[PDB]
Amino acid sequence: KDPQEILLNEAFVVPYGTPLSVNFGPTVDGDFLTDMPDILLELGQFKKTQILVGVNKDEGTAFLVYGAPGFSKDNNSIITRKEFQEGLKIFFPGVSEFGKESILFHYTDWVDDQRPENYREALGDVVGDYNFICPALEFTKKFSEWGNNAFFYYFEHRSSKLPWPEWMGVMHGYEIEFVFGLPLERRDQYTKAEEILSRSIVKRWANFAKYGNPQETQNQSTSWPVFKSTEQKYLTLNTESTRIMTKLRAQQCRFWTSFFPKV
Amino acid sequence: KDPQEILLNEAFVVPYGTPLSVNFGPTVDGDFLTDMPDILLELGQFKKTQILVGVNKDEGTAFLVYGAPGFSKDNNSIITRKEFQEGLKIFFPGVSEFGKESILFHYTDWVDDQRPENYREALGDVVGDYNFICPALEFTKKFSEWGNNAFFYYFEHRSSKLPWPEWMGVMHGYEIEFVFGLPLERRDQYTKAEEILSRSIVKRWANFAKYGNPQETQNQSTSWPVFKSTEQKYLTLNTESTRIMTKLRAQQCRFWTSFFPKV
Amino acid sequence: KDPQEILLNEAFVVPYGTPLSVNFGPTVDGDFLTDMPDILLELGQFKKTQILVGVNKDEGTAFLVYGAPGFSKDNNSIITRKEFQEGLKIFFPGVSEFGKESILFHYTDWVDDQRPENYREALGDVVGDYNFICPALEFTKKFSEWGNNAFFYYFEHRSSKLPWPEWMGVMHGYEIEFVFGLPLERRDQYTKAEEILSRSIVKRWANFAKYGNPQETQNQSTSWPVFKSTEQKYLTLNTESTRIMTKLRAQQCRFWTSFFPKV
Numbered sequence: 001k002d003p004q005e006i007l008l009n010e011a012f013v014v015p016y017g018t019p020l021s022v023n024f025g026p027t028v029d030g031d032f033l034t035d036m037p038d039i040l041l042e043l044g045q046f047k048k049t050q051i052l053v054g055v056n057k058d059e060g061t062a063f064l065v066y067g068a069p070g071f072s073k074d075n076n077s078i079i080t081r082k083e084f085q086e087g088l089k090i091f092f093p094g095v096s097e098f099g100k101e102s103i104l105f106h107y108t109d110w111v112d113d114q115r116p117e118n119y120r121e122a123l124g125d126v127v128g129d130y131n132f133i134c135p136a137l138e139f140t141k142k143f144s145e146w147g148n149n150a151f152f153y154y155f156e157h158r159s160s161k162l163p164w165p166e167w168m169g170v171m172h173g174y175e176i177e178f179v180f181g182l183p184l185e186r187r188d189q190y191t192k193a194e195e196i197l198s199r200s201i202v203k204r205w206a207n208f209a210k211y212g213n214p215q216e217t218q219n220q221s222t223s224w225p226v227f228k229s230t231e232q233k234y235l236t237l238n239t240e241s242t243r244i245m246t247k248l249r250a251q252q253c254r255f256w257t258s259f260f261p262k263v
Numbered sequence: 264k265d266p267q268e269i270l271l272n273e274a275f276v277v278p279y280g281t282p283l284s285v286n287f288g289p290t291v292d293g294d295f296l297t298d299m300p301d302i303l304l305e306l307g308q309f310k311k312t313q314i315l316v317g318v319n320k321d322e323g324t325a326f327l328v329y330g331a332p333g334f335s336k337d338n339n340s341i342i343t344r345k346e347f348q349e350g351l352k353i354f355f356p357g358v359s360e361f362g363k364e365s366i367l368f369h370y371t372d373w374v375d376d377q378r379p380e381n382y383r384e385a386l387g388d389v390v391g392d393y394n395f396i397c398p399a400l401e402f403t404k405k406f407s408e409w410g411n412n413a414f415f416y417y418f419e420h421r422s423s424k425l426p427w428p429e430w431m432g433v434m435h436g437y438e439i440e441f442v443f444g445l446p447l448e449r450r451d452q453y454t455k456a457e458e459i460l461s462r463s464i465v466k467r468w469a470n471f472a473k474y475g476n477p478q479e480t481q482n483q484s485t486s487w488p489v490f491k492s493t494e495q496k497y498l499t500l501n502t503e504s505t506r507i508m509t510k511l512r513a514q515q516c517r518f519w520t521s522f523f524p525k526v
Numbered sequence: 527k528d529p530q531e532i533l534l535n536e537a538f539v540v541p542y543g544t545p546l547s548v549n550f551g552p553t554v555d556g557d558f559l560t561d562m563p564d565i566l567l568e569l570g571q572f573k574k575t576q577i578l579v580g581v582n583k584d585e586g587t588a589f590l591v592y593g594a595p596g597f598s599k600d601n602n603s604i605i606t607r608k609e610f611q612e613g614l615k616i617f618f619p620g621v622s623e624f625g626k627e628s629i630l631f632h633y634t635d636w637v638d639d640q641r642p643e644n645y646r647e648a649l650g651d652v653v654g655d656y657n658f659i660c661p662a663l664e665f666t667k668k669f670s671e672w673g674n675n676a677f678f679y680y681f682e683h684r685s686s687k688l689p690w691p692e693w694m695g696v697m698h699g700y701e702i703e704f705v706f707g708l709p710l711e712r713r714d715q716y717t718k719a720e721e722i723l724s725r726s727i728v729k730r731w732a733n734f735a736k737y738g739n740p741q742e743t744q745n746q747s748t749s750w751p752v753f754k755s756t757e758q759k760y761l762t763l764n765t766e767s768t769r770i771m772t773k774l775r776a777q778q779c780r781f782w783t784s785f786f787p788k789v
């Protein structure tokens with residue numbers, strides 16, 4: 001077959017995809033992957049070494065404008081309860097009615113003013129928590145339980161140059177330019193605070209690679225504590241002030257991690 | 264003397280006051296107070312019981328519009344370095360030139376964009392840290408070292424009704440209406456999120472008084488941890504989400520607490 | 527170039543030197559030294575082995591007679607406040623006025639009789655603490671935090687043969703002859719107590735080299751405890767009686783180590 005015919009049919013190998021569909025991805029092949037990877041993680045079968053793991057404050061927003069009803073990069077996407085409900089059907093197509101209601105129940109207890117953006121924000125958090133943030137924290141816990149140092153970050157800076165609208169916040173993929181040091185180029189119109197945030201992340205990443213410890217030792221920076229089971233300390237990355245926090249998304253991730261897999 | 268003549272002369276009993284002057288206040292009288300109170304605190308001579316202690320995010324701002332040059336409730340008070348320097352002279356009149364420079368040095372290392380509000384914000388933090396926040400945290404540490412449970416809060420909600428301008432932020436005195444439950448009165452035009460914040464603070468205060476433990480046990484609230492030496496956990500009070508944090512103003516309070524008293 | 531022309535111009539490659547100038551010294555070359563050495567120390571990137579570290583009681587005095595005003599090997603060098611101030615300008619040429627005042631402030635709070643030698647002694651301690659003693663103790667702490675045994679000494683014996691005047695005390699470089707065992711030669715006019723001090727130091731050094739433990743095991747000597755973070759025990763070397771002490775120069779080194787680098 002022409003490579004085009006293979007590409008043109010990839011989308012259709014599944015009866016219904018979502019904006020998050022991975023139609024052709026890693027499998028347990030008995031070669032690269034010897035067993036179901038959840039089993040290897042749980043039972044400590046992996047390379048013993050240090051890890052650095054993190055997520056962005058609004059992981060799920062990018063996906064909402066690829067098909068969730070009432071969303072748009074070109075307006076504020078204030079959506080209704082009905083739209084939220086439709087959006088779950090878009091993101092959780094094989095899931096039972098009870099499964100989808102349990103998501104609605106966990107995410108729509110406000111908190112409290114009404115707050116036209118309530119449903120818009122909840123849908124981004126559903127998608128970001130389920131797909132990115134809770135699995136990263138779960139991976140980090142299970143990995144650290146076998147004795148290795150782990151460092152966890154929560155990136156919460158929105159790029160001053162971001163072409164996506166404000167409501168989408170600190171999107172998926174938008175720490176990358178900070179990690180590769182693009183704001184170090186003064187010719188590029190990033191702010192001065194961003195040049196500093198990038199320089200510091202660049203140094204922490206490089207110190208991690210060289211020394212297994214993502215500290216910035218020279219500028220009176222906040223010390224990055226290891227992420228342990230029990231305390232679960234993480235470092236926030238922002239332009240203002242680095243903070244040590246604990247138990248990112250504790251209540252949300254209990255939902256996705258212990259209850260949702262049963263549904 | 265007529266009480267008016269006493270009142271009219273009170274301001275002048277001091278060669279130079281500041282907006283923070285307490286001309287006639289508590290003294291060591293050998294009766295109510297048997298010794299210098301710093302000595303009693305340090306050496307554990309006080310009632311052994313639980314305490315609840317807290318401060319507001321912008322304690323020092325209220326005082327700046329009573330005489331610091333370039334400040335005004337009726338504009339944004341963007342002040343210069345020269346004005347900041349003059350402002351220290353207004354707030355630290357008996358203090359040596361070196362003392363005042365040490366304050367300038369500790370507070371003016373930015374952090375980094377310039378940031379026209381840099382000096383305005385620093386002066387509010389100088390006043391709030393020196394006068395309210397570091398002494399409260401120091402009191403809380405020394406008190407808890409003698410074995411009693413202590414709970415510390417950082418109030419960071421600006422009242423939607425605040426008549427003072429925005430730059431003054433979460434001012435001194437403006438948690439009080441939340442503590443006395445004024446936002447519980449729906450007729451009063453506080454937001455719904457404020458009614459909820461107040462109800463929860465009212466419950467924590469009442470639980471503290473009745474049970475020595477300022478928890479809100481029924482609504483899945485963040486648990487308020489005791490403030491201990493070493494970890495120094497505190498609870499943030501805000502309309503969005505209560506957080507447990509550590510070592511409020513660590514770098515600033517090291518300055519005021521260990522170095523400034525020598526100057 | 528003739529080697530003489532290179533030598534003759536070395537002094538001038540810098541706009542102002544001090545008696546402590548190292549115009550051509552180690553650099554981070556990417557070969558011998560792979561990174562800034564403060565970063566390697568802090569992040570534990572060094573050979574894991576035992577160390578023996580020490581300093582002399584008056585490290586800074588030797589340097590004062592190479593240019594500090596009012597100092598002389600040929601009189602008692604009783605200097606004034608003005609001379610002390612001038613001396614800081616000689617030793618801290620690139621340093622801000624505030625930086626130099628902070629040194630004056632930390633070192634001139636007496637303690638208390640006046641004490642004509644006050645300023646003379648303070649200037650020697652400024653130079654010795656900044657340049658030798660606090661960096662050695664800081665090196666020893668950071669090295670020991672990674673698990674290796676460290677032993678720290680404070681040499682406080684003035685050689686009976688010292689050609690420098692008394693006020694200079696236990697100078698920089700004047701333990702060396704004790705370490706190489708020159709006082710073991712009875713023909714040399716060192717005292718008997720010095721022969722014994724040298725014999726014991728020679729044995730401790732040799733036991734350190736052979737066995738990693740600088741004990742003198744046969745003569746009822748004071749046991750030399752490992753220097754740990756937290757307790758910071760060190761051994762004094764003197765002709766009278768060896769003592770175990772703690773936290774050499776604690777107050778001074780807090781100044782140089784945590785505050786001065788900011789200035």
Ligand SMILES: *[C@@H]1O[C@H](CO[C@H]2O[C@@H](C)[C@@H](O)[C@@H](O)[C@@H]2O)[C@@H](O[C@@H]2O[C@H](CO)[C@@H](O)[C@H](O)[C@H]2NC(C)=O)[C@H](O)[C@H]1NC(C)=O
Nearest residue numbers: 065066067068069070071072073074075076077078079083
């Ligand atoms: C934000 O826009 C959406 C997305 O679709 C629209 O893009 C707009 C910027 C505009 O060009 C519009 O014409 C275009 O269709 C709006 O939702 C859409 O609105 C109609 C009804 O008016 C629905 O029937 C559409 O199906 C729906 N599209 C999708 C993909 O849901 C949305 O209402 C708007 N929100 C605002 C203005 O707050």
Ligand SMILES: *[C@@H]1O[C@H](CO[C@H]2O[C@@H](C)[C@@H](O)[C@@H](O)[C@@H]2O)[C@@H](O[C@@H]2O[C@H](CO)[C@@H](O)[C@H](O)[C@H]2NC(C)=O)[C@H](O)[C@H]1NC(C)=O
Nearest residue numbers: 328329330331332333334335336337338339340341342346
């Ligand atoms: C904010 O206002 C201050 C405070 O004083 C002023 O109040 C203003 C709202 C206005 O009515 C003004 O006329 C009144 O005096 C301004 O600082 C003042 O400005 C003058 C020079 O223009 C100084 O000589 C005054 O001494 C000074 N007063 C004080 C108490 O410092 C301030 O500049 C202004 N800031 C702005 C607009 O950003």
Ligand SMILES: *[C@@H]1O[C@H](CO[C@H]2O[C@@H](C)[C@@H](O)[C@@H](O)[C@@H]2O)[C@@H](O[C@@H]2O[C@H](CO)[C@@H](O)[C@H](O)[C@H]2NC(C)=O)[C@H](O)[C@H]1NC(C)=O
Nearest residue numbers: 591592593594595596597598599600601602603604605609
């Ligand atoms: C200790 O001596 C110094 C150093 O300079 C001097 O050495 C002396 C032993 C003597 O030979 C003297 O003539 C020689 O200059 C004295 O300080 C010097 O004194 C003069 C003023 O009298 C100053 O103008 C010099 O600049 C100054 N030299 C330096 C390098 O500072 C010092 O006063 C003396 N102290 C005593 C006796 O207590």
Ligand SMILES: *[C@H]1O[C@H](CO[C@H]2O[C@@H](C)[C@@H](O)[C@@H](O)[C@@H]2O)[C@@H](O[C@@H]2O[C@H](CO)[C@@H](O)[C@H](O)[C@H]2NC(C)=O)[C@H](O)[C@H]1NC(C)=O
Nearest residue numbers: 008009010011012013014015016017018021023093094095
């Ligand atoms: C995997 O196998 C079948 C295959 O059905 C598919 O045929 C493909 C070639 C492709 O075009 C795809 O879109 C189509 O869905 C799946 O069966 C589907 O299930 C529905 C009901 O859900 C039935 O109507 C059909 O058999 C078929 N769908 C359509 C629209 O024709 C089957 O769901 C899947 N197995 C899984 C997901 O585990």
Ligand SMILES: *[C@H]1O[C@H](CO[C@H]2O[C@@H](C)[C@@H](O)[C@@H](O)[C@@H]2O)[C@@H](O[C@@H]2O[C@H](CO)[C@@H](O)[C@H](O)[C@H]2NC(C)=O)[C@H](O)[C@H]1NC(C)=O
Nearest residue numbers: 271272273274275276277278279280281284286356357358
């Ligand atoms: C306490 O005692 C004196 C008293 O001086 C004061 O006289 C009062 C009745 C009152 O009006 C007050 O404003 C006035 O200051 C203080 O002496 C002052 O110090 C200055 C120099 O700082 C001198 O000029 C005067 O003696 C006097 N000031 C003025 C403006 O006339 C003294 O400072 C104080 N003691 C303290 C603060 O410890």
Ligand SMILES: *[C@H]1O[C@H](CO[C@H]2O[C@@H](C)[C@@H](O)[C@@H](O)[C@@H]2O)[C@@H](O[C@@H]2O[C@H](CO)[C@@H](O)[C@H](O)[C@H]2NC(C)=O)[C@H](O)[C@H]1NC(C)=O
Nearest residue numbers: 534535536537538539540541542543544547549619620621
């Ligand atoms: C490194 O570069 C310049 C070089 O200046 C020097 O020229 C040398 C060849 C040598 O003779 C040396 O003594 C001379 O200082 C330094 O510039 C100096 O700074 C001063 C002001 O501080 C200026 O007047 C001159 O450019 C020069 N000094 C003199 C006396 O002529 C520069 O300071 C230095 N860079 C550093 C220290 O980081």
Ligand SMILES: *[C@@H]1O[C@H](CO)[C@@H](O)[C@H](O)[C@H]1NC(C)=O
Nearest residue numbers: 196199200201203216218219
């Ligand atoms: C540290 O601070 C300097 C000067 O204050 C700054 O220019 C540099 O970017 C900083 N280095 C890192 C790694 O953040």
Ligand SMILES: *[C@@H]1O[C@H](CO)[C@@H](O)[C@H](O)[C@H]1NC(C)=O
Nearest residue numbers: 459462463464466479481482
């Ligand atoms: C707890 O929740 C209820 C109902 O959800 C609410 O009305 C009440 O204000 C809350 N009580 C406290 C003490 O916060």
Ligand SMILES: *[C@@H]1O[C@H](CO)[C@@H](O)[C@H](O)[C@H]1NC(C)=O
Nearest residue numbers: 722725726727729742744745
């Ligand atoms: C130990 O003591 C002996 C005899 O009392 C003495 O001569 C010798 O110098 C000492 N040895 C050491 C290593 O100090």
Ligand SMILES: [Br-]
Nearest residue numbers: 081082085104
């Ligand atoms: Br419904």
Ligand SMILES: [Br-]
Nearest residue numbers: 344345348367
């Ligand atoms: Br200045």
Ligand SMILES: [Br-]
Nearest residue numbers: 607608611630
């Ligand atoms: Br002076």
Ligand SMILES: [Ca+2]
Nearest residue numbers: 057058156504
């Ligand atoms: Ca958040």
Ligand SMILES: [Ca+2]
Nearest residue numbers: 062172173174
């Ligand atoms: Ca992407």
Ligand SMILES: [Ca+2]
Nearest residue numbers: 220221222242
């Ligand atoms: Ca930092």
Ligand SMILES: [Ca+2]
Nearest residue numbers: 241320321419
């Ligand atoms: Ca703050």
